[PDB]
């Protein structure tokens, strides 16, 4: 069977950067090979066919080369609307095999979060559990910390973190951490506390709220 | 002009079946071709099958190859596959698509939308929906769907006339089993009071339709 790689798995680039993207298969399929754009939760877009043509309405920006065994797509100037994963896929004969993908994310001045919690509503209190919520917004860097203080101690294995794809106008990402607990457990603490330490920041973030 | 809609998708118990659908509008199926493609969720694109409408010639890939088949119907204008059999591994998103019309190649034009199918042994649970209330420039509110399954939820704020500053969250699978979200929206702190904001939640799967008010407290 014909095994399509490719290369890289990720990569992070600057707004007017040049862009390129490989893809291997593993015997001669000529000039029959396909290039696709697919955004989060979208269908995949095609981009490209027979290795060089591309398809009505896409953007000039994206080209694509290559003979035989070796392809590659090209993304000449990178807007903030290109972050998306990129498939080539060999087109003949059947099975048409696909590559594992490349997710390409843009690279933006840096951005520090703003950050808000959440104390839990009393009609979820009514069931018997507390959830605390903490907000990171539109900041980038993707990585970024966030600790949970309960009256000063620190949370571990008791919350969950949840990371927005990358906004595909501004690029910045927002991350949700939910601190959860049994009802009782919450109401034996009086300050619930949450500390955030990102790149954008030089001195860790702390934002907080008293039970009732 | 051109589209396919696709249905059918949701759980199924391991070892079980199911039937997936794949309407065409706007072009007739008969001398078209079409593809089914499903993406597992964290992974990439994985080329199942393909069919053409005019006298129902199929071909598969070899890790379907008898457990599915692809139909269509050329008088409802409408594709299908049904799969047999299935497995952890075959949770997924499922698509059609139709080959392009301009040359030989197995390029794929239009696509469905996609529809999810998870399989595994746990059963339909309803979410709950909570407030996220506001407190003090600008201002972020929202709400928490929690303890559901399967996936997915449908969140939109006030009917889908709100899209500024709206963040869904990926759900994220708890030790419970459940599935739990956050949909959350920044807004400016002088319209807090005479605008509304409203989440609409949607769980087809349990059939749950929410449309929870969020405001300050007391
Ligand atoms: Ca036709
Ligand atoms: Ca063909």
């Known amino acids: 069977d014909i095994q399509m790689t490719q290369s890289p798995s990720s990569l992070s680039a600057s707004v007017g950067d040049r862009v390129t993207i490989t893809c291997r298969a593993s015997?001669?399929?000529?000039?029959?090979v396909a290039w696709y754009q697919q955004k989060p939760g979208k269908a995949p877009k095609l981009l490209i066919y027979?290795?060089?043509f591309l398809y009505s309405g896409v953007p000039s920006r994206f080209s694509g080369s290559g003979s035989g065994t070796d392809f590659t797509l090209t993304i000449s100037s990178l807007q903030p609307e290109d972050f998306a994963t990129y498939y080539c896929?060999?087109?003949?004969?059947?099975?048409?095999?696909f590559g594992q993908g490349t997710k390409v994310e843009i690279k933006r001045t840096v951005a520090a979060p703003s950050v808000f919690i959440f104390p839990p509503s009393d009609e979820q209190l009514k069931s018997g559990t507390a959830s605390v919520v903490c907000l990171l917004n539109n900041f980038y860097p993707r990585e970024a910390k966030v600790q949970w203080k309960v009256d000063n101690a620190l949370q571990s294995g008791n919350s969950q973190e949840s990371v927005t794809e990358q906004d595909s106008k501004d690029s910045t990402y927002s991350l949700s951490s939910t601190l959860t607990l049994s009802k009782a457990d919450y109401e034996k603490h009086k300050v619930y506390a949450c500390e955030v330490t990102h790149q954008g920041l030089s001195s860790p973030v702390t934002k907080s709220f008293n039970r009732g | 002009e051109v589209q396919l809609v696709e249905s059918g998708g949701g759980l199924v118990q391991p070892g079980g079946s199911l039937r997936l659908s794949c309407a065409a509008s706007?072009?007739?199926?008969?001398?078209?071709?079409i593809h089914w493609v499903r993406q597992a969720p964290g992974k990439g694109l994985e080329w199942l099958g393909e069919?053409?409408?005019?006298?129902?010639?199929?071909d598969y890939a070899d890790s379907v190859k008898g457990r599915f088949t692809i139909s269509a119907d050329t008088s409802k204008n409408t594709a299908y596959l049904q799969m047999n059999s299935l497995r952890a591994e075959d949770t997924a998103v499922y698509y059609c698509?139709?080959?392009?019309?301009?040359?030989?190649?197995?390029?794929?034009?239009?696509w469905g939308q996609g529809t999810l199918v998870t399989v595994s042994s746990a059963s339909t649970k309803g979410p709950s929906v909570f407030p996220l209330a506001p407190s003090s420039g600008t201002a972020a509110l929202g709400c928490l769907v929690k303890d559901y399954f399967p996936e997915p939820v449908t969140v939109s704020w006030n009917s889908g006339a709100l899209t500024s500053g709206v963040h869904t969250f990926p759900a994220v699978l708890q030790s419970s089993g459940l599935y739990s979200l956050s949909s959350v929206v920044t807004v400016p702190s002088s319209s807090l009071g005479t605008q509304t904001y409203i989440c609409n939640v949607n769980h087809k799967p349990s059939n749950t339709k929410v449309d929870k008010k969020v405001e300050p407290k007391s």
């Open positions: 015997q001669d399929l000529a000039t029959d």
């Open positions: 069919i053409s409408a005019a006298g129902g010639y199929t």
């Open positions: 698509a139709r080959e392009s019309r301009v040359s030989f190649e197995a390029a794929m034009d239009y």
């Open positions: 027979s290795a060089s």
């Open positions: 896929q060999q087109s003949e004969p059947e099975p048409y095999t």
């Open positions: 706007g072009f007739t199926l008969s001398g078209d071709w």
